[model samples]
Target: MISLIAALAVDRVIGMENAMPWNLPADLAWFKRNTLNKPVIMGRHTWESIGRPLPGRKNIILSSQPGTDDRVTWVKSVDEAIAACGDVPEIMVIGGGRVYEQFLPKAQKLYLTHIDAEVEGDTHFPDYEPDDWESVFSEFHDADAQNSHSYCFEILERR
Candidate 1:
């Protein structure tokens, strides 16, 4: 099951100035727990934004650059990343923006976190026709004492 994971605003805004504006620790922890031990496909900029390669998970960075990180599998294209997933059960296409758009159509699932408020961003998740996917599951969280912003988690399946 190839998947796409992203955190966005109600407007589908993704990144601001190449980075996420909010520091939602819970979300990060959720991502680490779920995506670890899986092969993750990402473009060059996304990899660079992460600073370096992450351990444990197979980090496949796509770029024209001729080098790679210690545990990272650098590829030049989305097809290359898919090929690397070979016999693996699933691949997670984690992204910044462009990479998400590249694999959205091919993605079997989308793990989306909708933030409550909007922040300025230079990047965004691409919009597609509603019929293209079905919302199989949704979890909503209200603003609590800890988190001032409410958010929702959704799992969408290609129809």
Candidate 2:
């Protein structure tokens, strides 16, 4: 299974100045729990922001440059990333904007955290409507003292 995971704003704002726009600890915790021990694919800028290989997962970096942490496997294309993952039971395409775009077409499942606000940002999740996919799971989370934004976690499958 190939899954694409991300949290984006109402306007699809995914990043601002190479960083995330909101501080949602729930979303972060959700991300950590789901991605644990998965073969995770992501881009160079994504790696730069994350700044380290995600522990307990195969970190496949799609870049021309060789990127690593003993865990980071540098592969320049989707095919290369797929090859690196090689017969894995599941793969998670974690992202930077372009990486999401590259993998979205090939993704079988989507774990989308929809931040309920329109915020300013440089990079956006590539244009795709949720209506096109069938929702398999959904849960709305209200903002508390820790999280600034109310968000919904929706798991979608290809229609």
What would the per-residue lDDT of candidate 1 be over residues 53-104, giving only the tens digit for each residue?
7767888888877755656787777787799777788799889788898888
Q: What is the lDDT of residue 85 in candidate 1?
A: 76
Where model 1 places Cα greater than 4 Å from the true spot, the runs are none
Model 2 misplaced stretches (Cα beyond 4 Å): 68-71, 129-131
Q: What is the model-wide C-alpha lDDT for candidate 1?
A: 0.82
The count of residue-pair clashes in candidate 2 stands at 0
Encode model 2's per-residue lDDT on 1-159: one tens digit a residue: 789999989788899888886789999899999999889999989888988778898888888876555557888788989988989788999998999998888888999999987788899888987677999999998888998879999999999
Q: In model 2, what lDDT does residue 63 have? A: 86
Highest lDDT model number: 2
